[PDB]
């Protein structure tokens, strides 16, 4: 039935968790996190107690979005939920939400440490990012903030996409410019930036501020062509682009000296200024770069995700009751 809970003071609050979660050890103070050992499954886990989840309409709305999103994500290369619990026995005593996931003690920076990786290692890591992206994108979700710190990787370089949200170095140029109709290929831009860095051992676009970032990008990809200029709604944006000194797109072979030509080719297809022209995640997985990994029969797709439900304007007690239903309805994975 209901598990037996135990109480323990941790992170300046009294945590109340199932007996199955042992040796809680704080690893951070959105919400505070402890590392634990799950005696039921035999896994090391991260247990997150949400901070102030139902303090305001906004916090309530965010708690619900976060829970619904994590419950929906069921893929090897994306973070998922091992468990969700509340010590509450009713809606009326319900106030705290805890989320449980695989403990991931390293991100892509922790494993890569500014060093060149081998080409075979890059194929495996990027393959996994694109396999997870195919799945996220198939749900009609855009990550919007893919970077090394949002990618968990175990010592065996098995990788999961996360969202915890220099922080600007992997952002698509349109995002830097506050465009308002992004497509999924904003994430593909980020993947190109990550991929370039893994190969070379160096940040591709290490901008010092917002405008320097755009400057570095344009130096590599070129100033916008006529086709792209035709798609610019903003009269000021237009005027500005028209007064630029046309630089040709650099040749990526003379930037990524030494690299597998297949890698250089993929990067050319990812880092195209015009978002409409960037390769998609599904296309990228079929690219010859990934021949040793690609398997069309095990690159699964998600059920559709309804984002209008979290975009409602509801009362706190309404979001709290809806979040409660989500807690109670959780079914752990096999
Ligand atoms: N700061 C916590 C500490 O980790 C502990 C923990 C424990 C249990 C459950 C979750 C996290 C954290 C890190 S990552 C995360 N949440 C998401 O990444 N959500 C999310 C949103 C949109 C997406 F598209 C995807 Cl792919 C993922 N929260
Ligand atoms: C200073 C020049 C910056 C380059 C302009 C960004 C081009 C990005 O590409 C643009 O993406 C938009 C956002 O989804 C789409 O609506 C457009 O169709 C697409 O061309």
Give residue limits of the domains in the chain: 15-105, 106-301
Q: How far apart are CA 22 and CA 333, in angstroms?
A: 20
CB 209 within 8 Å of CB 301: no
Where do we find the tokens 């682009």?
241
Q: Return all residues near 90 (Cβ < 8 A) that are at least 6 apart.
A: none
**Which class in CATH covers the domain with range 15-105?**
alpha beta
Q: What is the 3-state secondary structure (H, E, C) of 262-302?
A: HHHHHHHHHCCCCHHHCCCHHHHHCCHHHCCCCCHHHCCCC
> What CATH class is the domain 106-301?
mainly alpha
Q: Tell me if 15-105 shares its fold with 106-301.
A: no
- Write the residue with the smallest CA distance to atom 5 of ligand 2: 174
Are 108 and 148 in contact, with CB atoms under 8 Å apart? Answer: yes
User: What single DSSP character describes residue 175?
Assistant: H
- Sheet of 31-38: strand order equals 21-28, 31-38, 43-50, 98-102, 83-85
Q: How was this structure determined?
A: X-ray
Q: Quick one: which ligand is closest to 100's CA?
A: 1
3 state SS of 333:
coil
Q: Which two tokens stand for residue 96?
A: 């705290």
| Ligand 2 site-directed mutation target among 144, 183, 184, 240, most atoms within 8 Å of CB | 183
- Kindly write down the DSSP assignment for every residue of 179-203, as one continuous string: -SS--THHHHHHHHHHHHHHHHSS-
The whole-angstrom separation of Cα 196 and Cα 263 is 9
Task: Give the integer Cα–Cα distance in Å for 140 and 306.
Answer: 9
How far apart are the two ends of the chain, measured CA to CA in Å? 18
Please choose from 233, 275, 277 the residue to mutate so as to test ligand 2's pocket, defined by most ligand atoms within 8 A of CB: 275
> Does the annotation place 49 within a ligand binding site?
no
């Amino acid at each position: 039935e209901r598990p037996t809970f135990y109480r323990q003071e941790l992170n300046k609050t009294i945590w109340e968790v199932p007996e199955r979660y042992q040796n809680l050890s704080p690893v951070g103070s959105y919400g505070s996190v402890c590392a634990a050992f799950d005696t039921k499954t035999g896994l090391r886990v991260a247990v997150k107690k949400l901070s102030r989840p139902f303090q305001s309409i906004i916090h309530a709305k965010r708690t619900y979005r976060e829970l619904r999103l994590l419950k929906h994500m069921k893929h090897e290369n994306v973070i998922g939920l091992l468990d969700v619990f509340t010590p509450a026995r009713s809606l009326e005593e319900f106030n705290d939400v805890y989320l449980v996931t695989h403990l991931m003690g390293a991100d892509l920076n922790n494993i890569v440490k500014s060093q060149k990786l081998t080409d075979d290692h890059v194929q495996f890591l990027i393959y996994q990012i694109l396999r997870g992206l195919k799945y996220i994108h198939s749900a009609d979700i855009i990550h919007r903030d893919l970077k090394p710190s949002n990618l968990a990787v175990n010592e065996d370089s098995e990788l999961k996409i996360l969202d915890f949200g220099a922080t600007r170095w992997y952002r698509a140029p349109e995002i830097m410019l506050n465009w308002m109709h992004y497509n999924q290929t904003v994430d593909i831009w980020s993947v190109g930036c990550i991929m370039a860095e893994l190969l070379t051992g160096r940040t591709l676009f290490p901008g010092t501020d917002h405008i320097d970032q755009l400057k570095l990008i344009l130096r590599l990809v070129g100033t916008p062509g006529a086709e792209l200029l035709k798609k610019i709604s903003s009269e000021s944006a237009r005027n500005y682009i028209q007064s630029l000194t046309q630089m040709p797109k650099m040749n990526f072979a003379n930037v990524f000296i030494g690299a597998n030509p297949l890698a250089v080719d993929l990067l050319e297809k990812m880092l195209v200024l015009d978002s409409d022209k960037r390769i998609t995640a599904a296309q990228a997985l079929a690219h010859a770069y990934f021949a040793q990994y690609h398997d069309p029969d095990d690159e699964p797709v998600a059920d559709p995700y309804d984002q209008s439900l979290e975009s409602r304007d509801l009362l706190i007690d309404e979001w709290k009751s809806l979040t409660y239903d989500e807690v109670i309805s959780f079914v752990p994975p096999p």
